[PDB]
Amino acid sequence: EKFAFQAEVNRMMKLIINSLYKNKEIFLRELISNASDALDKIRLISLTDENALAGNEELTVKIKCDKEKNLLHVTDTGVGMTREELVKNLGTIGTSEFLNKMTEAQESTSELIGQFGVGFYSAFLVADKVIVTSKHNNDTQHIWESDSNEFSVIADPRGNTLGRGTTITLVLKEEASDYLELDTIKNLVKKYSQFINFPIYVWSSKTKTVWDWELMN
Numbered sequence: 001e002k003f004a005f006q007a008e009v010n011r012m013m014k015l016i017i018n019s020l021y022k023n024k025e026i027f028l029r030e031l032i033s034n035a036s037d038a039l040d041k042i043r044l045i046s047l048t049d050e051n052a053l054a055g056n057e058e059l060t061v062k063i064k065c066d067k068e069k070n071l072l073h074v075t076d077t078g079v080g081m082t083r084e085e086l087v088k089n090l091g092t093i094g095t096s097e098f099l100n101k102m103t104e105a106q107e108s109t110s111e112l113i114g115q116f117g118v119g120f121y122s123a124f125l126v127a128d129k130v131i132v133t134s135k136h137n138n139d140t141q142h143i144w145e146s147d148s149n150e151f152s153v154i155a156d157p158r159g160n161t162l163g164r165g166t167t168i169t170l171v172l173k174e175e176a177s178d179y180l181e182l183d184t185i186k187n188l189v190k191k192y193s194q195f196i197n198f199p200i201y202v203w204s205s206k207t208k209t210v211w212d213w214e215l216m217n
């Protein structure tokens, strides 16, 4: 259940965190970009697999703020991940070139992070803990969590609650509490969803005060 990150991943997490220090809100752009890719994959599968979308008939990205819990949630209904995939895909990693590319560019990698497929780690810039709950058609719902010093994966004792997809839950750092603010979230989600071809909603409030999904693109 408990794993260590690959040496290269530790170096990469540090690089990413060190360079994006001043431009932190791109973590949201990167997570949204990953959710898009997840949806594209499931959509490509729905073409050859008639049952692919069985677990969840929708193809969306929903974001919600839990200010009391101090949590940020980014859930997609994409391909999702198996237990093995959570361990390999997040715990392991043009890797060597990217390393030299990043260092020589820090001595704006904001674009070089999205280029390569490692924007997920940028979450650690605003979170102390990152939790990945995911449901894949060929496995049971699992949870991956890490504070960057190690990571573990277990079976979700809650069972299949997603159907299919992934929820990225970020335990926000104290100085990152502005991201629990709906409007701070909407400005960032409306800015980073304008290129995404799947609908992105933010659990917002309207006034008396009812809550519901508000589309962002």
Ligand SMILES: CCNC(=O)[C@H]1O[C@@H](n2cnc3c(N)ncnc32)[C@H](O)[C@@H]1O
Pocket: 034, 035, 038, 076, 078, 079, 080, 081, 089, 090, 092, 093, 117, 118, 119, 120, 121, 166
């Ligand atoms: C190096 C960081 N790891 C990733 O972003 C990879 O992990 C998996 N991943 C990350 N976020 C998601 C997601 N929301 N849905 C599906 N796979 C994901 C993909 O294979 C990514 O390429």
